[PDB]
Amino acid sequence: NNYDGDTVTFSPTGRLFQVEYALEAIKQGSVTVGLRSNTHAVLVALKRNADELSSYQKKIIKCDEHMGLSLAGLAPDARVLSNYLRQQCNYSSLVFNRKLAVERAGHLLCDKAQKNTQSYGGRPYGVGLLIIGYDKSGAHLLEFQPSGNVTELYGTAIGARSQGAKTYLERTLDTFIKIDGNPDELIKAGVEAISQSLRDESLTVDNLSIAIVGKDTPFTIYDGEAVAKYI
Amino acid sequence: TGYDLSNSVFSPDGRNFQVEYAVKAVENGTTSIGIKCNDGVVFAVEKLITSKLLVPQKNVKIQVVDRHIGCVYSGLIPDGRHLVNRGREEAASFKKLYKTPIPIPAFADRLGQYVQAHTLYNSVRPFGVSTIFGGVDKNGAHLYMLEPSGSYWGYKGAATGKGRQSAKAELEKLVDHHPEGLSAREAVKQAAKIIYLAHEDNKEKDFELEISWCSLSETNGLHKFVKGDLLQEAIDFAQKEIN
Amino acid sequence: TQQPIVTGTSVISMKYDNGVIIAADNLGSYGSLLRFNGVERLIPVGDNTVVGISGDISDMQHIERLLKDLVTENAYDNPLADAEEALEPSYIFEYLATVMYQRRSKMNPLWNAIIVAGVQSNGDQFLRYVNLLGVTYSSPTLATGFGAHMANPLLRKVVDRESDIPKTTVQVAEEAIVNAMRVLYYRDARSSRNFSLAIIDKNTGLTFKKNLQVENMKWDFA
Amino acid sequence: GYDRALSIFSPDGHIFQVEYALEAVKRGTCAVGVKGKNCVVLGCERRSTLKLQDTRITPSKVSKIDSHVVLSFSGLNADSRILIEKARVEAQSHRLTLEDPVTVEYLTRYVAGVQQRYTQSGGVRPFGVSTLIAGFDPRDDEPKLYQTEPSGIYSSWSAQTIGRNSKTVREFLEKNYDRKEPPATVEECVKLTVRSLLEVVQTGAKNIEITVVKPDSDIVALSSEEINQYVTQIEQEKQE
Amino acid sequence: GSRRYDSRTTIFSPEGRLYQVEYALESISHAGTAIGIMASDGIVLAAERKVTSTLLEQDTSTEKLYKLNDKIAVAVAGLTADAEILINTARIHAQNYLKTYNEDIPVEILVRRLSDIKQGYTQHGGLRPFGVSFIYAGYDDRYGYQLYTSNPSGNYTGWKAISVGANTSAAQTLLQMDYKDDMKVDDAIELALKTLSKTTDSSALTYDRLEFATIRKGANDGEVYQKIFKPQEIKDILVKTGIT
Amino acid sequence: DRGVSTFSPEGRLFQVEYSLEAIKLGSTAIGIATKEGVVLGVEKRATSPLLESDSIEKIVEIDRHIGCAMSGLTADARSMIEHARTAAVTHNLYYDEDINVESLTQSVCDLALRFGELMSRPFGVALLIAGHDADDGYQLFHAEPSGTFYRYNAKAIGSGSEGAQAELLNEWHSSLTLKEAELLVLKILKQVMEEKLDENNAQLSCITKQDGFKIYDNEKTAELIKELKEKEAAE
Amino acid sequence: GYDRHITIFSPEGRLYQVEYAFKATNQTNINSLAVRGKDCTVVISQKKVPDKLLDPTTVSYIFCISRTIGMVVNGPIPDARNAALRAKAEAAEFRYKYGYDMPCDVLAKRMANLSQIYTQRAYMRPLGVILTFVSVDEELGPSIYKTDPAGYYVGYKATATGPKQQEITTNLENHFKKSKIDHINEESWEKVVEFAITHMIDALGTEFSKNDLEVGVATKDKFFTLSAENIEERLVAIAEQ
Amino acid sequence: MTDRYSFSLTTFSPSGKLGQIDYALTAVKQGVTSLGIKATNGVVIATEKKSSSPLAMSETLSKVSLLTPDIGAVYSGMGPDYRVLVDKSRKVAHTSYKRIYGEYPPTKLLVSEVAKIMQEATQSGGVRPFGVSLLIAGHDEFNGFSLYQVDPSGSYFPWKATAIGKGSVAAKTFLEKRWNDELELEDAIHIALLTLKESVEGEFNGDTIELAIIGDENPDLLGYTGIPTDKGPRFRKLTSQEINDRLEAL
Amino acid sequence: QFNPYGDNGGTILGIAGEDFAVLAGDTRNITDYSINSRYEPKVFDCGDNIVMSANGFAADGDALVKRFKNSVKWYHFDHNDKKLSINSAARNIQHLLYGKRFFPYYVHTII
Ligand SMILES: [Cl-]
Ligand SMILES: [Mg+2]
């Protein structure tokens, strides 16, 4: 109200409204789902078009051979944060001959977002990210909020109507965590999860975007006729 | 009025309302505690399980500084991480120049001065965390608690977050009933109980217990996380006391 | 640009069937003056890596502090610091190799020759060299300074190529290393009788031997 | 440094500081440009609220940027000096590096670029100045006349006016200027320029300045008497 | 943060005016009147000190008339402290030019330089403008005797006769009435003092309330002399012209 | 007042949303992509008859294989064009090849959100970037001040955009010829323009693989306008 | 009314942020007192530990700035420690640059100058503290110099600070009106501490245990704080006559 | 952090007033009275030592300060602002003059430097004006004795005699009746003490009054002998006893 | 005086066929009259069907190959996984080398 003019101001109840408004941009964004087993991790994203002449906005970005994310909210902010992750993954490989741990990648993203919430002149990031990866401790899934809060999960969803997919994953938890050594079945579970968030529209061949990373699987994005198999 | 719209502005009372509003964010956070024992310190924190999809034991909250100091905080988690990152830089530069690991009172002032600096200007926001920290140095065990204003003192026991009143009452009983002191292993058990008791203010969702400790006899003065059998033993002791 | 002041001589090392051995004497020379007699030049990092350093001792002590800081830093926000996310010999080497090459590129080198010896997570032997120029190389046997000229020829008679490594036991390898140290004591004017030796084995872990001496010496014939 | 964003968008998509800079131009004395077949004429209004002025030394309204290009303006006088200096420096820099003087379009593009920059740079306000830039490209006999404004947009004009009551003189020019047959001589062009200012000026005395630019760096400013002869001939034809 | 307290000194009004420049001009209208009159054989500078005291040390006092170099002087109307900042900068510019070209700086070049400095404070930096208007009286071998004025906007113009400060409307009308082109310095001296005598807000015009200066080629032969009048000399010229 | 980088309660940047309103006031620009080339057309919209309309430059070359049309505060486009040209030329210098149309567009869009308290505000202009490369063929992009860019088969921006886009919805198909696209841009420009369309107040351009980017002569466009009039009178 | 938020003049020529910083000074509800002996300078301050969970040994508002200079602070502890760290840095730098120990009055002036800057520069807020510096100066002898948020400072024969400063001040005034000398005419610092505690008891009307007080003593070449047992010995002597 | 107040805090109001300067002058008006009188062979500057507490040692608070050996200063208004200005004035006398010309600046030029500092606090970013008016008395070889007033705006004026602060209006009228161009230094001191008594409520003696002179050279205060051209400072602060001696002849 | 350069010996050979190419090199690494290694790989697969060797001072050689491999990675990131053609790689390597024109990589590079 009187306390939402900038990110450097607490409200009388201890809230940061600019951060909360940045969180609101994610809710307006298109739904994206993340889930994993013990061998693989999967991203599923519903891409959004402007109209029938336009392309469908890409949602998934590769960060390294073993790591990548999906976005919901301001796409240019995702480009800034994914570029930063690419650099940090790259620094780890060049300097230490070491693949960057997914948990450490989350810590770096948290700290980068935090600096934009405590200083004058800046603004919070207006995007949410779901990071998947396979490192020395197996498969991982992270959820990033521009408040700085990063959380490791078995599965999750962000964007508009994400609550439907999140409840489904909460039911299916015991099933999909056991889908080891079967990439197609894990993706099926993700496609079925994101379907719980659709209304009026359904998953078409230029609508759907899928990514996967695993034990002997580099981070690869599937679009177009490569996802027709799962429709 | 308007005195509360900008950081570092004195109200007619002589108060900094923006710092007082940061305290509200701390009071909204989960319960974290610290217990000073005979030859060390124990830290414990309540981790709210928002969903079944949270991977157990993975979202670690307690943080180590150097190899002998533990830090835990309640409020805005990112703010606490920022403070610990600074603490790690302060500890590194101290050890670089003076060789010896940073003493706990020395480390306490480093955090204190940094947090206080964020109450001097309107171009920065105060920290939305109260931090409980400490460890073992050459003069023995030390436990501290640091507020958004930059204010800190030494403690026998400390608590912050939503269930701080409950926790404080429990800590006060331990101080009265043990003037001679508490052992490190006893403190771990007691820390588990107090977090379980303080969870009544957050009773809607279930939680996960996380404990760490630095002890001269039990951990060689190094900070370590309580894991496996010792953690389960503390959880059992805690569950027995609430029933 | 500088000049080395207090210096350490040869570091020698070799691979064997289950791991690596590395050794270096305990002398810190001040030109031709044998000034300091209790200098440890093998520095262990965790339980899987030993870094052997020759050349300028002041720079060695700096590198020792960098490695100590590396262990502290790796443990930060790392629940698997003593397991899957522990420091590997390959991580430690690549970091040092980066530092050495950067420093020579600013025309302000760390005046050293370094051998990183260790065993990787998968049990693989690790042995690689780096110096003040940032030059790196690997070989079944590695040695610095005088060791390169006198130790390598002896150690290469045991392991001459990659296929000789599985045929070489820890007893044969240690024997060869100890003999090389004796030969260096005979012939290097900046060496000492006292030395340290470290074995990193994939089964028995890190064995660090201090206060070893060159023995069974021949002189008589004089 | 002072970094405050003074030029910003409003809910209706307007940048008020740029629009208010145009209001400063509206207040400035009227300037007019007319290109003939082989010349360009720049006319300027002098407000007669200031007498006891020393006309020898008082800053003249038309300024040479190089030997072949001139610049006139409407709006804040102090602001115009900064644009004129920058343009003169750039003109010499162009000669030094390209070994050829600036084209009239290039010089216009530069000045317009400076004006635009001051509409989305922190800590600065836009120039309260619109300019008329006229001349001939090196080794070219085609007349050139351009206009710039605070926003930084620029364009070429057969004839144009800026400043106070420029709506009226543009009305005159739009019905009196024929594109198929522009003023064929210097005389005809100057006459049409003086006529256009007489719609707005008041007394045809020391209130009208006229500068004629011809090809090959031939630039001359008309005197009071020379202009007075045009003023006389125009009204004697009007008495009919 | 800090934006809250920023007055934004360098913005246009909806009418296209610079607020701070306009308000600085309002300030200057309450300053003591300064007058410059240019003649064929020299220039006169006359200025009124603001309501003085009997205990003010007049003979060592200077608030209106300042020397920039041997050929150029200024009359000040507005904040004296602001004026001295600009005056010192102008003195340095003149010396820079003399060092570079080994010739005295032409009057207009000095005036343009100071005026550009004033202009800068209205367009960038977020600082308040200088609350000063200058009358420049000077001589060079290109244009001879010259009068200029500059104001907080950084705009400058040339004049035969001009006033700044208080009652400029009344003063300018009186000057416009009696000024002629073939006028001489001694006639201009009389016009300047008569104009101040009529426009002043004081009861009577006396020597202790005035600062006076002339720039004459009344320097022996082909050169120019500046004369900052002493208190007794102002008293004498007041009697000579028949005002006291 | 309020920050230049402030979010609204709906999660949108005030300044970006306001710059979009300025673009709505701009003159119309239309692009149509075909397998034979991409066509770009603009409304010139001269404010007076004395303004020489061929000095109005709202279609611009970025490289031989990339063209660009603008709508909104067109003075803001100049630094964007400068950057685009520099990026295209720089990439050729570094890699001895043409730059991809998407990569060029992405480079331009990186400038967009570089504002705050960097430039003091967002750009008040939208761009249609058209071009060809060997990997993805003929392409048309819409670059906004939000930093977002969408690929389009056809797109209209400016004051007549929603009426024009509805028209492009009905008319575009994947088998359009270059000639059919040219007439289609002319037809829709004529529909949404205030003044009557001719070769002096409207401009056409195209990008083909063979000939690269070309702005059409007024004589060439005048013939296409005459061809349009006759085929509309043909039924 | 933004002239109340930053350090600019109000229409009355006042600086409200400075005035409100003076009010923050009494937020701790602690009173302090300083007096001079023949060979020493003594400072006493109330000690209140309201929480049983606190470590009482870490609760302090007296600081050892240098070997010779001590400082007691009236105000919140964060600002107190801010001032303490700076004073310590300034004292150490002085000795390095000029080759001799920083005098008590010179440090006070330096800290007062820093405070003055906060009252003139808008981006910096005043510190809500009053700083009382004590020493036995090698040139001036026993010294008390006190600094406030306005940037004012002056030397004192004796002084008092806190919510009940007036009661203590008047009590001290009345004693020096009797004795007609500028100090406590006593040989040992122990008795000067006893004087200081006695007159605080009289002025406040309250009794003190060993844990209710905090004492600092400056002698030639060193400043030191008393332990609870040293204070107890002082309290016993007071009660025994 | 960083000082983000890069804009002026003093600006022109619609009426042409610079508010912050006016308010600074109001703070000076509330200040304790100080005065200065110029004689033929010297200058005197004086003020009241308004002690904030009787426990305070008012000798440790110097309201009258030496700037150079031949220049002194007194103020009315905010004490802390004065103290820092004295530090800056002492330094600028060296950096911008003595380190260049090998001699101390003349009174008028040092005044000019102090004035410039005060002017800049009236225009520079993120600062308020100084809340003091200064009276600066001094002597130099070519200008003789002089007395100057410097205001918060940075404006300065030379005076024969004047007063600033609390009771300045009444004091200036008192000085107008008594001053003439034939006063000797002792006469000026006598008039100074008479004038200052009117604005003082309580005790009026050498311990409550601070008074200094610019007069003859004091070779006894030089600290060394052997250089004929060096004859000692002309600034001298009168002692408590010296003031009381002249209060009997009052 | 510190000499930032050294000579690690080695010999490399590149030959272009009609529809193939070979890049060969010996595996010996030396300083002065000593052998550092009998097998130290000198020719590297850099991705996108490009092989590279930077012979001479091995520290500079390793640094250049490492930076080029990195350039291939970022070319994929920045340009939609487009394959880096051999001519484009060659021009890119020129800029990597000329970037240190006044403190050169002491190597003779062949791709
Ligand atoms: Cl200081
Ligand atoms: Mg302040």
Contacts of H157 in chain E (CB under 8 A): 56, 61, 63
CA distance B16 to B149: 9
CA-wise closest residue to H177 among E231, E57, E54, E56:
E54
Q: Answer for the pair F202, F44: CB distance below 8 angstroms, yes or no.
A: yes
CA distance F155 to F127: 11
* Neighbouring residues of E242: CB distance < 8 A, sequence distance ≥ 6: none
CA-wise closest residue to D21 among D124, D145, D138, D107:
D124
Inter-CA distances, C127 with C9, C60, C155, C166, Å = 19, 19, 14, 15
Domain count, chain B: 1
Ligand 2 centre to CA of F3 (Å) is 23
Q: What is the DSSP letter of G186?
A: -
Q: State both tokens at A192.
A: 């079925």
C-alpha torsion angle, residues E164, E167, E169, E173 (rounded to 10): -90
The answer to whether A215 faces chain C, any CB pair under 8 Å, is no
CA distance B127 to B116: 9
CA-wise closest residue to G22 among G194, G215, G138, G152:
G152
Residues of B annotated catalytic, as ranges: 30
The answer to whether I40 faces chain C, any CB pair under 8 Å, is yes
Task: Report helix, strand or coil for D197.
Answer: helix
Q: Which of B25, B54, B81 is facing A111, going by the closest CB pair?
A: B81
Distance spanning both ends of chain E, measured CA to CA: 61
CA distance C122 to D182: 89
Inter-CA distances, G188 with A40, E148, F131, G39, G208, Å = 80, 79, 95, 8, 22
Contacts of F75 in chain D (CB under 8 A): 112, 115-116, 119, 151-153
* Cα of C149 to nearest chain A Cα, Å: 31
Between CA H200 and CA H206, with CA H205 as vertex, the angle to 5 degrees is: 125
Beta bridge partners of E158: E148
* Cα of D27 to nearest chain E Cα, Å: 8
Buried residues in D49-77 as b, exposed as e (16+ CB within 10 A): eeebbbeebbbebbbbbbebbbbbbbbbb
CA distance E230 to B182: 93
Contacts of B124 in chain H (CB under 8 A): 1
**Quick one: fold of D1-240?**
Glutamine Phosphoribosylpyrophosphate, subunit 1, domain 1 (3.60.20)
- Match 């209004």 to its residue by tokens: D45
Ligand 2 centre to CA of G117 (Å) is 7
Buried residues in C166-178 as b, exposed as e (16+ CB within 10 A): eebebeebbebbb
The answer to whether B93 faces chain G, any CB pair under 8 Å, is no
HEC secondary structure over chain E: CHHHHCCCCCCECCCCCEHHHHHHHHHHCCCCCEEEEEECCEEEEEEECCCCCCCECHHHCCCCEEECCCCEEEEEEECHHHHHHHHHHHHHHHHHHHHHHCCCCCHHHHHHHHHHHHHHHHHECCCCCCCEEEEEEEEECCCEEEEEEECCCCCEEEECEEEECCCHHHHHHHHHHHCCCCCCHHHHHHHHHHHHHHHCCCCCCCHHHEEEEEEEEEECCCEEEEEECCHHHHHHHHHHCCCC
Beta bridge partners of A46: A208
Q: Which of C109, C133, C139 is facing I38, going by the closest CB pair?
A: C139
The answer to whether A90 faces chain I, any CB pair under 8 Å, is yes
H or E segment at C103? helix C89-105
CA distance C110 to C87: 23
* Neighbouring residues of G233: CB distance < 8 A, sequence distance ≥ 6: none
Domain residues for the domain of C151 are 1-222
Q: State both tokens at H134.
A: 């200064």
| Candidates B130, B153, B155, B175, partner chain G, best to mutate (most G CBs within 10 A) | B153
CA distance D117 to D86: 13
The answer to whether I90 faces chain F, any CB pair under 8 Å, is yes
Put simply, the answer to whether E27 touches H157 (Cβ < 8 Å) is no
Task: Report helix, strand or coil for I69.
Answer: helix
Beta bridge partners of A131: A69, A142
Contacts of E2 in chain B (CB under 8 A): 122-123
Put simply, the answer to whether B67 touches C75 (Cβ < 8 Å) is yes
H or E segment at F138? strand F137-143
Any chains having at least 3 CB pairs less than 8 A from chain C are A, B, I
CATH of the domain at C83: 3.60.20.10
CATH architecture for the domain at A1-231: 4-Layer Sandwich (3.60)
Locate the chain A residue with the closest alpha carbon to E4: A5
On the 0-12 / 13-18 / 19+ scale of CB atoms within 10 A, E174 is buried
Q: Does domain G1-241 have CATH number 3.40.50.300?
A: no
Contacts of B88 in chain C (CB under 8 A): 76
Q: Answer for the pair F40, F33: CB distance below 8 angstroms, yes or no.
A: no
* Cα of E4 to nearest chain B Cα, Å: 9
H or E segment at F205? strand F202-208
* Neighbouring residues of E70: CB distance < 8 A, sequence distance ≥ 6: E104, E224, E226
CA distance B195 to B238: 9
The answer to whether E125 faces chain D, any CB pair under 8 Å, is yes
Going across the sheet that includes G70-74, the strands are G62-64, G70-74, G130-137, G141-147, G153-156, H56-57
Inter-CA distances, C59 with C62, C113, C131, G7, Å = 5, 11, 12, 52
No. of helices (H) and no. of strands (E), chain F: 6, 10
Q: What are phi and psi of A45, to 5 degrees?
A: -135, 130
CA distance D179 to C105: 69
* Cα of G68 to nearest chain H Cα, Å: 20
Put simply, the answer to whether E12 touches D21 (Cβ < 8 Å) is yes
Distance spanning both ends of chain D, measured CA to CA: 65
Inter-CA distances, G189 with G38, G192, G202, G216, G220, Å = 9, 5, 20, 11, 11
Question: Residues of F at the E interface (Cβ-Cβ below 8 Å)?
Answer: 1, 3, 117
Q: What are phi and psi of E220, to 5 degrees?
A: -55, 90
The answer to whether H52 faces chain B, any CB pair under 8 Å, is no
The answer to whether A136 faces chain C, any CB pair under 8 Å, is yes
Ligand 2 centre to CA of B16 (Å) is 14
Q: What is the DSSP letter of I73?
A: H
Put simply, the answer to whether B53 touches A115 (Cβ < 8 Å) is no
**Residues found in chain D:** 240
Task: Report helix, strand or coil for B224.
Answer: strand
CA distance D64 to H100: 45
Give the distance from CA B46 to its chain's centroid. Answer: 11
| Candidates C71, C84, C100, partner chain A, best to mutate (most A CBs within 10 A) | C84
Put simply, the answer to whether H158 touches E27 (Cβ < 8 Å) is no
* Neighbouring residues of G130: CB distance < 8 A, sequence distance ≥ 6: G25, G73, G74, G75, G146, G147, G148, G149, G161
Instruction: Mark whether C1 is an active-site residue.
Output: yes
Locate the chain A residue with the closest alpha carbon to C92: A96
**Could you please report the per-residue DSSP string of F49-89?**
TTB-GGG---EEEEETTEEEEEEESGGGHHHHHHHHHHHHH
Q: Which of C101, C148, C162 is facing I59, going by the closest CB pair?
A: C101
Q: Which of residues 61-80 of A touch I (CB under 8 A)?
A: 62
Put simply, the answer to whether E4 touches G2 (Cβ < 8 Å) is yes
Residue type, G141: G
Q: Answer for the pair D29, D164: CB distance below 8 angstroms, yes or no.
A: yes
The answer to whether E12 faces chain G, any CB pair under 8 Å, is no
Q: State both tokens at B206.
A: 């279930």
Q: How was this structure determined?
A: X-ray
User: Closest ligand to G8 CA?
Assistant: 2
CATH of the domain at B121: 3.60.20.10
CA distance F219 to F196: 17
Domain residues for the domain of F188 are 1-235
Contacts of H125 in chain D (CB under 8 A): 2
CA-wise closest residue to I27 among I40, I45, I44:
I40
H or E segment at F105? helix F101-112
- Domains within chain E, CATH numbers bracketed: 1-244 (3.60.20.10)
Domain count, chain F: 1
Q: Answer for the pair I93, I86: CB distance below 8 angstroms, yes or no.
A: no
* Neighbouring residues of F219: CB distance < 8 A, sequence distance ≥ 6: F199
Q: Which of residues 83-112 of A touch C (CB under 8 A)?
A: 94-98, 101, 103-104, 107
CA distance B171 to B194: 8
Ligand 1 centre to CA of G114 (Å) is 7
Any chains having at least 3 CB pairs less than 8 A from chain G are B, E, H
* Neighbouring residues of F29: CB distance < 8 A, sequence distance ≥ 6: F40, F41, F42, F43, F58, F69, F70, F71, F128, F156, F157, F158
- Domain H1-250 classification at class level: alpha beta
Ligand 2 centre to CA of B149 (Å) is 18
Ligand 2 centre to CA of B10 (Å) is 10
User: Closest ligand to G125 CA?
Assistant: 2
The answer to whether C148 faces chain I, any CB pair under 8 Å, is yes
CA distance G32 to G50: 18
Domain count, chain C: 1
Q: Which of residues 36-75 of D touch E (CB under 8 A)?
A: 50-59
Q: Which of residues 68-87 of B touch G (CB under 8 A)?
A: none
Locate the chain G residue with the closest alpha carbon to E2: G123
The answer to whether E123 faces chain D, any CB pair under 8 Å, is yes
**Domain ranges for chain D:** 1-240
For CA atoms A111, A117, A121, A124, give the dihedral sign.
positive
Q: Specify the pairing of strand C194-201 against strand C141-143.
A: unpaired
For CA atoms H14, H15, H18, H19, give the dihedral sign.
negative
CA distance D31 to E45: 35
Contacts of E1 in chain B (CB under 8 A): 6, 122-123
Task: Report helix, strand or coil for H101.
Answer: helix
Put simply, the answer to whether C133 touches I4 (Cβ < 8 Å) is yes
CA distance D160 to D178: 13
